[PDB]
C-alpha cells in the first residue's frame, strides 16, 4: 500500500491515471519498460483501423472490446502493468485516454531525470565559452539539480543577453529589456525628484 511519490502533481482523470501508472511502475523498476509500450500502442493505433475502432466506435460492446484486448495480449513479451492497464481502459471504453496518459507519462519521465526542456533566445550565435557560462546562470532559475536540455535560437532584436523560455516561465535577462527598464526607472525618478 506504500507507493513511491510522483515527481510532480498533475491534472484529473487522464493525468492521475498516468500518475498511478508511474507510481506502480516505479515500484517494479519498470518505467522505461512501459514508456516504450505506450509509444508502441500509439503506433498500433496508427497502424490498424480495427484497433482504433475499439477506442472510437461506441457500438462495440465492452465484452467484445475487453475480449479483443485480453486475447491479443497473451503476455506479448510485455509488462504485466501494461496488460492490467489496457484491459482496465478497455472495460470503460477509455482507450482514447492512452494518447494523453502518454503525454503525462512523458512529463513525469522527463521530470524523473530532473531534465528540463527549454529554448534560449540570444542576439548572436553563441561561443562555447558563452554557452557554458549561460548554463552557469540558467541553472539558478531551476530550484533542483535538474540538468537542462537547453537548445539555442537567435533573434538580434535583443541587444545582447539571453531570454530563457522554460515553457512555463520566462527569464528576460536581455540587455534590450534592461535598457527599457533603465529608461522606465529614470523616467519615474525625475518626475518625483
Amino acid at each position: 500500500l506504500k507507493l513511491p511519490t510522483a515527481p510532480l502533481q498533475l491534472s484529473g482523470t487522464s493525468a492521475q491515471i498516468a500518475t498511478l501508472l508511474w507510481q506502480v511502475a516505479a515500484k517494479e523498476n519498470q518505467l522505461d519498460k512501459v514508456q516504450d509500450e505506450l509509444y508502441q500502442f500509439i503506433e498500433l493505433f496508427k497502424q490498424h483501423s480495427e484497433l482504433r475502432r475499439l477506442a472510437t466506435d461506441p457500438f462495440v460492446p465492452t465484452l467484445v472490446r475487453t475480449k479483443i484486448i485480453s486475447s491479443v495480449l497473451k503476455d506479448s513479451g510485455a509488462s504485466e502493468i501494461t496488460k492490467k492497464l489496457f484491459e482496465a481502459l478497455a472495460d470503460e471504453g477509455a482507450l482514447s485516454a492512452l494518447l494523453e496518459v502518454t503525454v503525462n507519462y512523458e512529463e513525469l519521465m522527463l521530470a524523473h531525470k530532473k531534465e528540463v526542456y527549454c529554448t534560449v533566445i540570444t542576439a548572436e550565435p553563441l561561443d562555447k565559452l558563452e554557452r557554458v557560462e549561460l548554463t552557469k546562470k540558467a541553472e539558478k532559475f531551476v530550484d533542483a539539480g535538474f540538468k537542462l536540455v537547453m537548445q539555442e535560437k537567435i533573434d538580434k532584436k535583443l541587444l545582447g543577453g539571453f531570454v530563457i523560455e522554460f515553457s512555463d516561465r520566462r527569464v528576460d535577462m536581455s540587455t534590450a529589456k534592461k535598457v527599457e527598464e533603465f529608461n522606465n526607472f529614470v523616467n519615474k525618478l525625475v518626475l518625483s525628484i
Partner: peptide, 29 residues
C-alpha cells in the same frame, strides 16, 4: 491524421481512476 480521433477522450464513469487502481495495484508482484 489517423490519430485525430483520439486527441481528446470522452467517457462515462467519473470514477475511472478507481477502476484503473483496482487493476494496477495487483499488477505489482
Amino acid at each position: 491524421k489517423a490519430l485525430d480521433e483520439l486527441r481528446k477522450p470522452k467517457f462515462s464513469s467519473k470514477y475511472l481512476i478507481q477502476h484503473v487502481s483496482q487493476k494496477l495495484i495487483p499488477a505489482v508482484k
